[PDB]
Structure 1
């Protein structure tokens, strides 16, 4: 190696005066720039369009936080042509050179941490620590993939030798692909999904989520200053499915990297399986599609520790995480003790404008608000509402931490991803039943168990079927490198982010033999 061993970027807690001062300064600079317009980024240059998109502050929706250009099919085609033109030479860059470019981008992002965090606060309603964790994770993806990519450098394949011949196998990138990013981790996942494929020689066209187009543009300002060659990375904010559908079904799109709802993920995977007219390859599609994550607590657990972890997991970033604890499975002996503690802690959570660093900011949009409130109405017919369950005062999309108890395992609110601050509590007889209920959903992303019994923990290690399992701690916040992130079943294709294996997904192998 030529750089220090990988270490995760520390997550700012803002416990010091300097940290709080720096954040206030960043928040001021960001809001003073709410009037800024961000164009598309195609072929190494910012390209504007006639029509525009408006980004709103979910904590005060009448306030615009910025506007961006709006890509259509014409711009998507232009981006694809630029991406393929760039691929022709970018694929030949020595890996050491590509990795150094990523390291430069990480250094630039680290120097703009507060600015990006403040943008997350105002654009998507993350409180201070959620915002800091998001940006820190983006930096981690860049630092991690830059190093991981070197493990695949020419010629990396272990082969069996043969007399009188040189047999060399090596990896090569696929080509130009499309990245469809989420609004809940618009810096972290947006960055990771792009730089992973790019690190090993691919080129990318990235479509940010509508609710997070401004922060996505700021990430591209970093890519631009870093110096990625024209066409290697492209930015196409857009409205509706136009751009995404056009690229996903395009005969010249080589791969698709997607993180979002199961509904969209299913359509993408189906489309990727089809041979578009003139297509000359089998498309690769990687999808991360959510979950219905549960935390199991049995009677041997430290009930206070469990309650704290459950509240953090269920309500962090208003429960808008694919990893959020949306189900709390309690064995009979743990039911009353844990539920009472969870309710006591949850009722003390503050909800308000994200910039004030409340425990919960607003949900991301009017549409998300409508969806969450709709599920709350559904829940009233399936379980017992014991906490919250309503919209709070203010134009901002503030929803109170919600808890439903005595929820049937097969109830809609115990099966479908609400993606809001709504926790469903399920009572079970014993640990075996807890595991059965935990596994009985179409998903398999995150899960947790609070217990002191070794046999129960190791039992879960073998049978709680989720891609990311945690014992006696929160089930959210997977760290790059430490906890490869990705699930089973309808949670996706198990493309483990923040792991060496992730980069292999964007490479193909060639074997060349020379008989002397």
Structure 2
């Protein structure tokens, strides 16, 4: 309906070519976003680097004021933005509004976290007596221009989680939203524009990653790449970054380890909520159940009953299971479902597909020779893998190339901590689904699941460097 524009050096810019966005659940035309050229990318980066000097010389309190204003505007327009976001990525209406609200919360928290940045004073006399009068005054500085790249499934939340930590520290930022999700990304940018963010301090880039993706990453003007998306794309970003710093939040295949002494009802509740939330289109979703044989039959039945209770419908109706982001995703999920069936897996809930609306499929008796045991579906399908020992569960869990998070369901917490030490993941939730929040907590993935540590204070630290001034007291 509307022709959207990029925020470039404090002004709204059209491009010669544009990309029409459609609602994945209905095909409704939502608008268009610019298809930037390489020359327009250069202008965005040139504007950012020119604004950096005056921006980093502002006080922390002044930079924090801008972020607070943008958060206030997001809360004001949460219904407006969430309504469009719901259509753009086929997310439940209420869930879409919640994302906008959560984004404002992260921006506010990042502003107050970052303005309290402190330095250190180190003593030369800690290392050698002859240097006892030498001290080091170590203060934090920005890294420069941060390229922020958000994913389709949380195009606003996982944009703000990068923009706010970067800006408070004195960096300038360019946001590359996902094409499917660029409208919501540009709506987020409108809030920062209305808040008065100085020209060039924050800008947006839109275009198909397959066309301009490598160019925006390879560009020498960029000092830092903060990316959330698929593991293959993250792999390429790692190569193109060279020796420049990066943060990557990539794929996940979070395991849920259920021991013999677990509250099976509580486990089934958390497993189903985490696995099928947003139709399973989340990196921190429960994506495989590793359950001890003794309790597998009872756990599978309780999970099944809850899966049968999930609603399947449209975003406007706040259905639990909504249509997937596009046809390719549904075809990929259907293939994984077909593979499990052909190899003897027991489908405890039935596969059905209407367009790209896939019903929630629960598989039992999944074996490691099935693709569904390892590949990230990003769809509403959950495998149950039976194990005989906790060592096997740890073994199978760590054999995955992914290591984002894991859940352990048990009443023996000392043992759970011991298991957690052996799991090659960033975060382990006890008797709870895997999840990124609360946003002050650390969020990181091991192995192919990412690089660097996020969460608010951790993001700020990652996107800063240090400047040491050393002198001798006389």
**Residue equivalent to 2:287:** 326
> Does structure 1 conserve the Cα–Cα contact (< 8 Å) formed by 2:115 and 2:168?
no
Equivalences for residues 103-182 of structure 1 within 5 A? 103-153=68-118, 156-160=119-123, 167-182=136-151
SS in 2 for 1:219: helix
Equivalences for residues 312-351 of structure 1 within 5 A? 312-351=273-312
**CA offset at residue 460 of structure 1?**
2.4
The match for 1:415 among 374, 389, 392 is 374
SS in 1 for 2:30: strand
**Residue equivalent to 2:63:** 98
Q: 1:176 to 1:455 in 2, by over 3 A?
A: closer
**Residue equivalent to 2:458:** 501
Provide the alpha-carbon RMSD of the alignment.
1.8
Partners of 1:380 and 1:90 lie apart in 2 by 57
> Does structure 1 conserve the Cα–Cα contact (< 8 Å) formed by 2:426 and 2:444?
yes
The one-character-per-residue Cα deviations of 1:7-39 (angstroms, maximum 9, x if unpaired) are xxxxxxxxxxxxxxxxxxxxxxxxxxxx11111
**Residue equivalent to 2:29:** 64
Tell me the matched-pair count.
467
> Does structure 2 conserve the Cα–Cα contact (< 8 Å) formed by 1:376 and 1:389?
no
The one-character-per-residue Cα deviations of 1:478-503 (angstroms, maximum 9, x if unpaired) are 2211x3211111111132223x2221
Partners of 1:494 and 1:401 lie apart in 2 by 33
> Does structure 1 conserve the Cα–Cα contact (< 8 Å) formed by 2:121 and 2:135?
no
Unaligned 5+ residue runs, structure 1?
A: 1-34, 274-281
Equivalences for residues 10-21 of structure 1 within 5 A? none
Matched, 1:36 2:5: no
SS in 1 for 2:248: strand
SS in 1 for 2:403: coil
The one-character-per-residue Cα deviations of 1:397-416 (angstroms, maximum 9, x if unpaired) are 21111122211235321111
**CA offset at residue 136 of structure 1?**
2.9
> Does structure 1 conserve the Cα–Cα contact (< 8 Å) formed by 2:263 and 2:409?
yes
> Structure 1 length as normaliser, TM-score?
0.87
Equivalences for residues 276-355 of structure 1 within 5 A? 282-355=243-316
SS in 1 for 2:428: strand
Partners of 2:295 and 2:97 lie apart in 1 by 34
**Residue equivalent to 1:221:** 190
**CA offset at residue 382 of structure 1?**
3.6
> Does structure 2 conserve the Cα–Cα contact (< 8 Å) formed by 1:40 and 1:70?
no
Q: 1:385 to 1:64 in 2, by over 3 A?
A: farther
Partners of 1:303 and 1:513 lie apart in 2 by 59
Q: 1:244 to 1:378 in 2, by over 3 A?
A: same
The one-character-per-residue Cα deviations of 1:401-433 (angstroms, maximum 9, x if unpaired) are 112221123532111111111111100002232
Equivalences for residues 165-204 of structure 1 within 5 A? 167-204=136-173
> Structure 2 length as normaliser, TM-score?
0.94
Partners of 1:91 and 1:462 lie apart in 2 by 40
SS in 2 for 1:74: helix
**CA offset at residue 376 of structure 1?**
2.0
**Residue equivalent to 1:472:** 431
The one-character-per-residue Cα deviations of 1:448-497 (angstroms, maximum 9, x if unpaired) are 0111123432222322221121111221352211x321111111113222
**CA offset at residue 184 of structure 1?**
0.7
Unaligned 5+ residue runs, structure 2?
A: 125-130
Partners of 1:292 and 1:364 lie apart in 2 by 19
Partners of 1:66 and 1:83 lie apart in 2 by 27
The one-character-per-residue Cα deviations of 1:129-150 (angstroms, maximum 9, x if unpaired) are 4324422321222122112212
SS in 2 for 1:299: coil
**Residue equivalent to 1:28:** none
**Residue equivalent to 1:54:** 20
Partners of 1:453 and 1:176 lie apart in 2 by 47
Q: 1:405 to 1:74 in 2, by over 3 A?
A: same
Q: 1:72 to 1:370 in 2, by over 3 A?
A: farther
Partners of 2:382 and 2:223 lie apart in 1 by 40
Partners of 1:438 and 1:494 lie apart in 2 by 21
**Residue equivalent to 2:209:** 240
